[PDB]
Amino acid sequence: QVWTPLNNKFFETFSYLPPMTDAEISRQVDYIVSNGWTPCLEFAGAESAYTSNENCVRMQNTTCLYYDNRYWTMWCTDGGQVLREVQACRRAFPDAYIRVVGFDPVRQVQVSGFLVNRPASVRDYQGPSTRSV
Amino acid sequence: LTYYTPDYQPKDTDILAAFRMTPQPGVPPEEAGAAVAARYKGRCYDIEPVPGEENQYIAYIAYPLDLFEEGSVTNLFTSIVGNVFGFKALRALRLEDLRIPPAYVKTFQGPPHGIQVERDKLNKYGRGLLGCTIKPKLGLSAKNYGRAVYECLRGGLDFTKDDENVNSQPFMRWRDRFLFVAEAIYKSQAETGEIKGHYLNATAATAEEMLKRAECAKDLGVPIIMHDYLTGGFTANTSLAHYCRDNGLLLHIHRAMHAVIDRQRNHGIHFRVLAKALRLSGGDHLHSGTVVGKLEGEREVTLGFVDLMRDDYIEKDRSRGIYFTQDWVSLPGTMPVASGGIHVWHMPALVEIFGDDACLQFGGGTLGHPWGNAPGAAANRVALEACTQARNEGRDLAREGGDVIRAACKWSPELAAACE
Amino acid sequence: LTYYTPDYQPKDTDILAAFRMTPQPGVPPEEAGAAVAARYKGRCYDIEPVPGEENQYIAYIAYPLDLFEEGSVTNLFTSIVGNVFGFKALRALRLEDLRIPPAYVKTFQGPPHGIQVERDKLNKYGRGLLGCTIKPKLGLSAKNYGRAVYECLRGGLDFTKDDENVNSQPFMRWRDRFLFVAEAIYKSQAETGEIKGHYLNATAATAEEMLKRAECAKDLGVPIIMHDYLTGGFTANTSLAHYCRDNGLLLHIHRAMHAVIDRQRNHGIHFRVLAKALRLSGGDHLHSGTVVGKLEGEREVTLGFVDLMRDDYIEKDRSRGIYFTQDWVSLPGTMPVASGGIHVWHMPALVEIFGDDACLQFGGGTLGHPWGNAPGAAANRVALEACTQARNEGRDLAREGGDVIRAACKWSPELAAACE
Amino acid sequence: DKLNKYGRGLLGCTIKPKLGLSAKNYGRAVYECLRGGLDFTKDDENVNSQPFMRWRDRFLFVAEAIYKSQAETGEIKGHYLNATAATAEEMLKRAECAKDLGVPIIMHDYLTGGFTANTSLAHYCRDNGLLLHIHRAMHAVIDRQRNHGIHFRVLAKA
Amino acid sequence: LTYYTPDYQPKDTDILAAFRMTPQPGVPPEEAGAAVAARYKGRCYDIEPVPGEENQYIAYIAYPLDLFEEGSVTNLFTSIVGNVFGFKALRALRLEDLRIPPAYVKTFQGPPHGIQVERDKLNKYGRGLLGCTIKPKLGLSAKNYGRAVYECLRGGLDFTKDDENVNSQPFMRWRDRFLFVAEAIYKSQAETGEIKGHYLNATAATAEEMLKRAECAKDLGVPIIMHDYLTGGFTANTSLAHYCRDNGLLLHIHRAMHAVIDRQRNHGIHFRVLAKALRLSGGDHLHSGTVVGKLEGEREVTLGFVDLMRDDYIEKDRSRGIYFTQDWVSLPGTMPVASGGIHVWHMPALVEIFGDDACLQFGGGTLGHPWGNAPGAAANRVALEACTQARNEGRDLAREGGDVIRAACKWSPELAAACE
């Protein structure tokens, strides 16, 4: 079989697994909470979801390690609350990818980041069986 | 003995070494420790016999901080192990550990970015990184090398790397390879939407040539380069690490020629000291182990030097080979890179042993997947993500790795052709 | 075995290695040689058992010339001994010799000046050179270091040198030492009328700092600098050697950390390979032996690597450890430097063993002469000149060294206080 | 004229927490505050270059945040990047990085860095078209007591 | 004769020359060879008479490798043919061939990219390259020159080139031409989707000006430049080739003033020696022949120097003028460029003679197509592709070239107006 290079976009962690269900998202959020970390939600439409070099035109010397759309837009006690917020974000922005992020409150660093929602309207991604043709 | 002072209390600024030495018969251990030790004099303050080996002692030496040049791994190695392995009074001598006082650590820049800055720059969290060594090792043209890089990266791999002996040869000059690899990296980035990279080998004959190759990598905008620090030298490595910090480049470190110094148990320098010297000199990644069949070497020793090269504060643990408490005073950590034959069903073991802050390298070049390079990379990525997800759910990977692999294979056609 | 080809005839451009390997029991020697060997493939073309050692063989490997980067000792060592000492199938492995084909040799600059250009620049002919290591090793201020240098050089010594661990410390910064040593060198030159020099240590943390120290030495007009190539690295050494050729500076090379790689007979890289790598990378002098009591190590082995690092054409001689004929195609030779406890009555032996093309180093700092540093230097110079004159007359030094020393002492008051 | 903002005061925020935040999280906070409608954000006065957040990582992440907020809102945005450093060479290098990123404005502590360093930075900013925000750290040590010291108005004129 | 040694066996590192000499009557051939030959002495080791010419001999001279400066074609030509064509004892003298030992070859960088790297960079495989010389030769403004370049490239030509005498004149300054040609190249690339190029003439009065023109070409991002090596000089050429390797630029070489040295059979230097000197100095393309009517010159001689400038290993073949076996030890090959009146029906002959690794140049400026420059370029491209396809099918081009051309013309309206 051949890995398809057409409409096969991916979003880093857990993006190569089948779309996670509510129970799986809940278990991941519980894992984040268990470690002592804070979960939050990021979202972006299809125009600002993938990495790009749009602003590299303004730079000189080098553009090493600079990529656009690394930041998404921010949307935290347990899995159920984060799941409710996931549904709320889905209703508010149906054409936007949702990403669950984790933040270590002591080190003040991001420790987690996995996609939990892919807009049905957008078709820039494949499915577990359509990834190979 | 003016140089054996068992009542001496080491200062907070002393550099401490733990030597495993076997003196010649008739030489008392105190005399041998005094010799190794011999205001600016190194002194043996502690000697303990090794329980299990005949005529084997651990000698603890304290060096004043004024003895060394600030921020110079070269000087540190010249002072500590310059001419001490040639003493006739010692049948065998092995440096086991070093204690770098914070006062000395603060004089070093350290790794250019570290693990957390690397994760933030690459926007990859919660999982180990994946890499492949482009194979065949040599003979491939820059165009074909770039084609292989693009094929492996588009599958889902986060990194690819040049072979350790690929610097600049008649078959493939370095600038052609850099250009074709840059095109491949950018194509794979556009196709998958994830940030990709390739460990471009900057190891060269002269520091000027090495800096020129780093400069070309910086001008292409590519993320990361590679260096052979034990063959290029600490002086060349430190220059490259300073350059990478200045210009925002990641630095992968390969430990070529390491077994010539850290293989024999009785003679040489233990890899943990070389790992601490690398972290001081600078490196974002450091090839730290081989997985032939399984992770080779005592697990505790591996865990010890992985913690020594990763954490900020490592307490003394003789079980794992930590002879001294090591405070890193906020020096950036180095990401360990486990390479070799990482088979798909062996991923759960390595994910359990290393965790998320490591790079698993398929130095075998994969190619074992009947479909191609890209599906093989996808299978590996699927397996790693499935193992990580299972571990996050509370599963015991060492007991359910096969079950997790099978369950992932049930829905992954690419992994199905890999699991067979 | 695709990699064991006993009928293969090595090409005139192949790089040849002679490995002394002890395979694990049950592993045939042919299989082990095939593994070490494994168009661009290294191949084992010859295996000979070691007569005198059990399960010990010499494996001859042929590498194509296209495998290596032109003028890069770093790449050569990465390719040959990068990851081969870590093979589990080998109980022990030792690289004994290398054959550098002329085609490869011509891609290297080599030593900046060589022996003959050194003699012409220093205007010293027909005798060995003399040097001292300023002692105490550390703690001395730049002013006092310069005073010691001037006192030792005015006596008749041709060179002095910084201690191997003296680079730049709180007690003595490097630029102060360079300035005071320059004043001392010029004072001793004016006083004696002979050209003097001091091995200024340029070994530093970064290549930039090392080049800055070399630049300061060039701006002072002093003749020679020093480098630690096994700790600084081949990349740093090659940069320094290119700089020294460009700016007309001599380069003394110290082999710090050598015993960590060339001490054990079963594992490591023999010093002769490190000496050939140094000659390729560049160095006018290379500390080549210690004289504790007497010249240590098998004489034939020492003579072998001295000839390998000095002569232009060395024929294969297994008695002296030459496993391959080495053609240097007019590459400048490196002057061997024998250091350690060179006592006055031991000068005839070393003059006989080394001849005129060597530097005898009093690394003990002398100080054994009751009168002072300067008369001790004079005594040494008188002894060396008397031994050379006796050898030129047809005397057998190994049999009449004591007679020659006594006869010189009969007229030398300085040597009289030294001979006691 | 450069910022195309007329008829109103400008608005700025100091990214908080003061210290401990990673360059990524600092950039995230900058982007979140700027996208709301703020014209400027600024580094904390004591944020120059620390083990927790090196200066070049912060400059890069802040540049990405500034450009994202500009694209989202359509208004020109900026962040007072702290160029205050130990040596004039390091300070000019940080200003040079800001110039190479195309970001609008940098910051300096003139009473702690010194007038000599400030004048060099101001000449550089005029030469390269960069705005310069000045923070008066250590001012109360000289302009607080009514009987002794130098009144702030003299420091403002200087 | 101390310089005629018929029993001498040339070394593997000797530089060998084969001189065709006609001595004055009364001078024996041995004496004349001894004179040309006259540890560092050149020696005549072989003399063979020419069967077919009266008083004509081939003299073989062996020069030691130590005689020449590493990587210097200038020195090689100064040593070999500096002052030997002015000997009164020789009626005529002609250097026929040179043997460059691998040891010497390794000291040269060679062509910046070579044939295979060129093909990979341009992404063109399996066919010869096509070029045109913009005509009229002179008088055209930079704007009109660019217009002609764009019109010829959009038709399907891979390259265009400046006239040999077009460097920088009042009618067309060089920077205006570079800018307009860059615009034309980019327009043609966007229109056709194939990578295009134009041989920009960097030949200038001073090396500084030549490097400035190369720098402008590099700043425009254009692929290739041109140089006149026999008029600019080997020193200027070697500088340009090093620059092109450093900055990733292709280098086309034009052999202006060649007939002044390689035309007469009795006196001068044969073009094959100039081609080997160019390959050593550096050049990706080398104008190698003219096709006035048909490929001019003995086919075997042309094939010989084409193989000498293309292949890695050329065995001695006196039938094709190869007097010595030439090992290139992986030096990049040079692409031969056949220029002149390449008419459409003459394409099969040149495709058969040269193969795919050559550039056919329409130095006549085409313009013979009644429709325009672009359709004429298309006709040429169609003819070349049809001939290549026929050759790949097993057709005999020398016998079916007309049939293939007619068959291609049956479906190509552009070729129909060209075939008439």
Author numbering:
A (entry chain P): 2 to 76, 83 to 140
B (entry chain A), C (entry chain H), E (entry chain B): 22 to 59, 79 to 460
D (entry chain F): 160 to 317
Question: Which passages does the manuscript contain on this structure?
Answer:
This concentration also saturated the α3–α4–CsRubisco complex. During processing, we observed a low-resolution density in addition to the core subunits at the equatorial region of CsRubisco in the RbcL. We hypothesized that this additional density corresponded to the helical regions of α3–α4 and that substoichiometric binding meant many binding sites were unoccupied, giving rise to poorly resolved density where the linker binds.
As the primary gateway between atmospheric carbon dioxide (CO2) and organic carbon, ribulose-1,5-bisphosphate carboxylase/oxygenase (Rubisco) fixes ~400 gigatons of CO2 annually. Eukaryotic algae concentrate and fix CO2 in phase-separated condensates called pyrenoids, which complete up to one-third of global CO2 fixation.
